[PDB]
Amino acid sequence: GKSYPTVSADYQKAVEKAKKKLRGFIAEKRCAPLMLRLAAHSAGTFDKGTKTGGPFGTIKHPAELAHSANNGLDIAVRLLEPLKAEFPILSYADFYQLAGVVAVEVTGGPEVPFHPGREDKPEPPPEGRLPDATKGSDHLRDVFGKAMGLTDQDIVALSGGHTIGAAHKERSGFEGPWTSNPLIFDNSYFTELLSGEKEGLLQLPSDKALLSDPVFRPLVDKYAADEDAFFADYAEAHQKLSELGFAD
Ligand code: HEM
Numbered sequence: 727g728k729s730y731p732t733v734s735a736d737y738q739k740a741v742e743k744a745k746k747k748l749r750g751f752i753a754e755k756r757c758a759p760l761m762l763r764l765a766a767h768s769a770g771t772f773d774k775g776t777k778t779g780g781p782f783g784t785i786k787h788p789a790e791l792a793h794s795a796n797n798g799l800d801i802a803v804r805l806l807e808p809l810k811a812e813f814p815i816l817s818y819a820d821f822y823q824l825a826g827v828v829a830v831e832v833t834g835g836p837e838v839p840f841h842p843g844r845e846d847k848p849e850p851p852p853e854g855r856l857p858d859a860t861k862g863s864d865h866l867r868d869v870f871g872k873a874m875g876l877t878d879q880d881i882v883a884l885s886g887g888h889t890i891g892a893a894h895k896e897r898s899g900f901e902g903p904w905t906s907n908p909l910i911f912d913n914s915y916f917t918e919l920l921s922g923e924k925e926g927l928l929q930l931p932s933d934k935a936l937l938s939d940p941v942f943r944p945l946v947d948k949y950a951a952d953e954d955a956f957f958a959d960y961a962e963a964h965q966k967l968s969e970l971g972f973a974d
């Protein structure tokens with residue numbers, strides 16, 4: 727369903743240069759997980775029925791950063807400003823999605839296809855559209871399915887983005903990494919979910935919801951058994967998420 731816009735050769739050149747600069751920066755700063763949260767959590771404000779929100783750079787706005795769900799994303803935005811200034815031609819919308827793609831790549835994940843041309847939109851979406859970590863499978867379908875327009879497969883694969891990073895008690899209130907290797911992108915999120923609650927590792931209620939749902943559980947089993955299958959489905963879902971409301 728996608729018809730990507732034309733961008734100039736100069737725009738394309740800047741995308742390529744920014745991609746490389748983002749690799750070095752994100753690797754050095756150890757901030758891949760925060761950058762993936764910035765890209766992916768921000769994309770998840772899309773509502774398909776109204777064609778509002780989505781990955782259009784509004785998360786830059788202090789007003790959107792101030793939403794309690796976005797606690798800590800101001801750090802991500804601040805970290806990227808100096809680099810972004812080296813690429814004035816790029817939209818913030820494209821820049822943040824590129825950062826998310828690079829975050830997955832530099833931690834060892836799949837190469838998620840990237841298409842430029844997102845425009846920076848003036849008005850943040852209303853607060854309250856983001857997935858709620860305390861809720862379950864019905865809520866996940868409401869947000870990812872009814873609002874975003876993503877599939878059940880996409881939900882489980884994208885939940886695997888928690889294979890990098892950690893929660894912080896001062897941000898969400900939850901605390902700790904999902905895996906023993908929070909800077910490595912692999913299928914351990916699913917392996918850990920299956921094995922039970924190991925000491926020192928985190929499972930949100932929203933992660934646990936995947937285990938008890940008839941459609942989600944087979945996918946969790948698949949990804950725990952087959953990292954290649956996870957990487958394929960993950961790359962597909964991340965691309966879709968990064969493109970919500972964009973190019974159709
Ligand atoms: C499935 C629905 C989701 C829920 C309920 C959820 C919720 C959360 C929560 C509560 C945190 C902790 C924030 C903190 O305290 O620092 C978090 C972090 C994170 N999220 Fe999600 N999220 C979801 C989907 C996603 C998706 C789709 C992605 C990307 C594919 C993603 C990527 C991340 C990453 C990488 C972190 C770690 C950030 C860090 O290390 O600072 N999440 N998420």
Ligand code: NA
Pocket residue numbers: 889890905906907908909910911912913914915
């Ligand atoms: Na991991």
